[PDB]
Amino acid sequence: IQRTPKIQVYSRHPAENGKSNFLNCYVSGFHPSDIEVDLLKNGERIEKVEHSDLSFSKDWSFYLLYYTEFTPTEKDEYACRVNHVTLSQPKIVKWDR
Amino acid sequence: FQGPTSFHVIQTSSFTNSTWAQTQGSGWLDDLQIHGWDSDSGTAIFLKPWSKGNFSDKEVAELEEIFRVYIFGFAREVQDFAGDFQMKYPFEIQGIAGCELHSGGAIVSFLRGALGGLDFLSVKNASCVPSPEGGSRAQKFCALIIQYQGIMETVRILLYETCPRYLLGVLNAGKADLQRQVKPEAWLSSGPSPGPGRLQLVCHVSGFYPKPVWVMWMRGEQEQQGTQLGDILPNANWTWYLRATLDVADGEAAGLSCRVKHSSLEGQDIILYWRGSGLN
Ligand SMILES: *[C@@H]1O[C@H](CO[C@@H]2O[C@@H](C)[C@@H](O)[C@@H](O)[C@@H]2O)[C@@H](O[C@@H]2O[C@H](CO)[C@@H](O[C@@H]3O[C@H](CO[C@H]4O[C@H](CO)[C@@H](O)[C@H](O)[C@@H]4O)[C@@H](O)[C@H](O[C@H]4O[C@H](CO)[C@@H](O)[C@H](O)[C@@H]4O)[C@@H]3O)[C@H](O)[C@H]2NC(C)=O)[C@H](O[C@@H]2O[C@@H](C)[C@@H](O)[C@@H](O)[C@@H]2O)[C@H]1NC(C)=O
Ligand SMILES: CCCCCCCCCCCCCCCCCCC[C@@H](O)[C@@H](CCCCCCCCCCCCCC)C(=O)OC[C@@H]1O[C@@H](O)[C@H](O)[C@@H](O)[C@@H]1O
Ligand SMILES: *[C@@H]1O[C@H](CO)[C@@H](O)[C@H](O)[C@H]1NC(C)=O
Ligand SMILES: [Cl-]
Ligand SMILES: [Cl-]
Ligand code: NA
């Protein structure tokens, strides 16, 4: 009955340290629709994150895109944190260039 | 013509308990959002200057009034049905309705509804058709709905008369954005793959519009059949991202290239070459 989200973290452009880019977190295949998504920089919630309005696929699974401008560096860690009824606790998926 | 060929409206109505339900709605051209539904105002948000297509302000307001009345009436009807039947809270209902322009010019309309993420009903040639997944509950719902005067008639007009003229008007109004050409960029990456002496090569392709694209791993002119296409992922601002992977034996990656063909490239395919020994 309930469907756990798939979480995909990717950058808009190939990563280059010091060059501005966009970090995307695509959350999909989940049911029901209620979900909490945050983009993190070094384990802290980024405030300037935008997101799509709710939509769903042909099989009725919901999906959302969360994104923010980011300037990757050698040290900084970025991630997507998701909470949903199907998850025991928030699931963190790290961005890996 | 290129770009989207369909318009649809979607509904997600979330029922928390017998007295509390909330609806989210939006309008789309294929995967591109053009309308939002503002629950604070009971009106539509027009996301593009051309989102009203060739419709007058009066027709747009009459349609918003129909959706406003529907969203209110629907929640009340479901809460009544849920009580009469074996429905446990919380539950979610989804709906999708719209039309699409096919090759040859025919416009086909559709309406589908779901309960609990499973098919529940559809509208096939102006009547309510229960889906087998919906079982007896869908049969009773369709029989109840057709008893309410004017409903099926309003559905028929919206689907078969209003939607087709709307779609044509909006595909023309939005053509400069819908039929625009945006060039992708591409890059390579690699990593270990399951099993001894296996490598996975990845060809990333990002920023292309419209959606149709061709990406393949190659050895000279030989297309590698083993190329696996990932699902096309969205970027913000109406562009797409795709990963095309190839599993190869270690020591057999040299000689591989990734070729990208896209409508925006004017016949200049992107060709990336994988190099061994960390020479990427
Ligand atoms: C928004 O745009 C819609 C689409 O417009 C067309 O496409 C866009 C992209 C632009 O290129 C436009 O310039 C272009 O018009 C409008 O809807 C369309 O309106 C036209 C013009 O009224 C209409 O054509 C009429 O069609 C009927 C036949 O229709 C039936 O049969 C066809 C198959 O053959 C079928 O596809 C239809 O669904 C119907 O079953 C025909 O009898 C008419 O002929 C009469 O008029 C012409 C002059 O126009 C004359 O030469 C003839 O001799 C005769 O008197 C005429 O050809 C299209 O059918 C219609 N398209 C659709 C899919 O509905 C839309 O117009 C408004 O709605 C219409 C239904 C009609 O009531 C119009 O009066 C309205 O303005 C427009 N605006 C809005 C608000 O929707
Ligand atoms: C610019 C963007 C625009 C895009 C344009 C494209 C067109 C979109 C095409 C997609 C089609 C969208 C379909 C949405 C559904 C609209 C339904 C309208 C109903 C109202 O109608 C209806 C509202 C009351 C709701 C009653 C609860 C039942 C709800 C279950 C309906 C299931 C759906 C049917 C499937 C079997 C009504 O009974 O309302 C009162 C009516 O209006 C009065 O004026 C009239 O006098 C009365 O007799 C009627 O009863
Ligand atoms: C239903 O849920 C709402 C919102 O969570 C709450 O305010 C309300 O009092 C609940 N009512 C019932 C039927 O118990
Ligand atoms: Cl497209
Ligand atoms: Cl080589
Ligand atoms: Na978990």
Residue numbers in the entry:
A (entry chain B): 3 to 99
B (entry chain A): 4 to 283
Reported in the publication:
In addition to CD1d, which is designated as a group 2 CD1 protein, the human CD1 locus encodes three group 1 antigen-presenting molecules, CD1a, CD1b and CD1c. For example, CD1b tetramers carrying a mycobacterial glycolipid, glucose-6-O-monomycolate (GMM), demonstrated the existence of polyclonal T cells recognizing GMM lipids and among tuberculosis (TB) patients.
The glucosyl moiety extends substantially out of the CD1b cleft and can exhibit mobility. TCR engagement caused two major conformational changes. Namely, the glucose headgroup was flattened by the CDR3α loop, being displaced by ∼5 Å towards the α2-helix of CD1b. This bulldozing of the headgroup was essential to enable favourable contacts between glucose and the GEM TCR, and also enabled TCR contacts with the CD1b molecule itself. Repositioning of Gln152 caused a ripple of conformational change, including the displacement of Tyr151, which caused re-orientation of Phe84 and Phe88 as well as shifting of Phe144.
